[PDB]
Design a protein around this ligand. Structure first.
Ligand code: HEM
Ligand code: HEM
Ligand SMILES: [Cl-]
Lengths: 179, 178
């Protein structure tokens, strides 16, 4: 539907693949371009990822207000670089209660506080796909100007050192350049 | 996916429709039976679908209390079932996580009230807003005939809660197991 998005790796698309880092677990086959389509769905395509936009799961009102105060819009003119990061979390994560996951997410890991410092440099989108039976749980999307490449790379090193990332069992970085 | 379930109202299925009460908003056309399929035909009036998902509000202490009393599905005695599709308003979904949790339990005592009716009533929760469905949730309950009066009481207590001020559409589909 309107909230469903598909990412198709192949020879066509609006984004050129700069590199793919297989951070953790099985990776994705290297391709020339990524085609992004609004909806569900590839002759010379190597892989296909899909997720949906959904409601807030963890952020509290005060956190949303801070985010909504500075987060930039998508498709900025200077935002020619983008990074697609599919992520999967362990079964131990999904069996835990809501309060247990909230505490790890922000209290122990400060996911929102840490990321909020890298705005408005980085725009972001979050898509869910575990409920669709996909091989990943989330598709995360970030786009920024080349100036913030080092800053974004620093954020990744920090996030991957948090308690939350002890439950990440698969992760891939797909670096993209807008055409 | 095997977490997906479809409910097909028509002339075939494992459950006979006893009654359909259109509580709030547009209802569902009355049919003869409901067929349940684990996954995603002619002579079918409507199809509803949803998926099982992770916990969204319950805290550990509440999960422990539920797991200590909640019964399993498919009890021999539980020949009655009720399918209640629900849709919540757009104002509900725009709220933050803490705002919705506070309405759900602090103000409405959803879990505390519901616990008073276990182990008599077995339950299942399916999500479908994210699939673009006309409802947000498909809730399933099954129980022996002795608990039908208690279940109607539960419904009235729930619909008087703060949480239900955000329900925009609700239908009751009473079923008997064939
Ligand atoms: C750069 C600024 C960032 C900000 C402001 C930010 C903020 C947030 C917020 C508020 C949520 C919670 C959404 C909700 O409540 O439903 C979230 C979820 C998430 N973020 Fe970020 N984040 C950032 C960067 C990142 C990065 C760099 C990654 C991965 C490399 C990432 C991966 C995730 C994942 C996987 C989730 C979902 C976790 C779950 O639901 O279990 N985020 N982010
Ligand atoms: C009979 C005993 C009941 C118990 C033990 C119970 C318990 C619960 C619990 C713990 C949740 C939270 C699940 C989560 O955190 O993801 C929940 C969600 C829900 N329940 Fe119940 N409940 C009962 C009866 C009912 C009834 C009678 C209805 C409707 C007529 C109902 C409708 C719902 C809905 C719609 C949700 C999802 C709410 C949302 O996510 O916004 N429940 N229930
Ligand atoms: Cl689908």
């Amino acid at each position: 539907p309107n909230n469903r998005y598909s990412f198709i790796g192949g020879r066509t698309g609006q984004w050129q693949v700069v590199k793919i880092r297989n951070v953790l677990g099985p990776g994705l086959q290297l391709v020339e371009k990524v085609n992004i389509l609004n909806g569900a769905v590839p002759l010379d395509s190597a892989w296909r990822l899909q997720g949906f936009a959904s409601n807030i799961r963890y952020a509290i009102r005060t956190e949303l207000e801070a985010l909504q105060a500075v987060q930039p819009m998508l498709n900025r003119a200077e935002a020619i670089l983008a990074v697609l990061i599919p992520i999967k979390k362990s079964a131990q994560w999904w069996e835990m209660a809501q309060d247990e996951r909230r505490d790890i997410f922000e209290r122990e890991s400060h996911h929102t506080a840490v990321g909020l410092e890298y705005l408005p440099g980085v725009a972001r989108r979050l898509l869910h796909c575990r409920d669709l039976g996909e091989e990943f749980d989330f598709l995360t999307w970030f786009e920024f100007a080349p100036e913030h490449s080092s800053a974004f790379n620093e954020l990744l090193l920090r996030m991957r050192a948090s308690k939350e990332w002890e439950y990440v069992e698969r992760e891939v970085e797909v670096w993209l350049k807008r055409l």
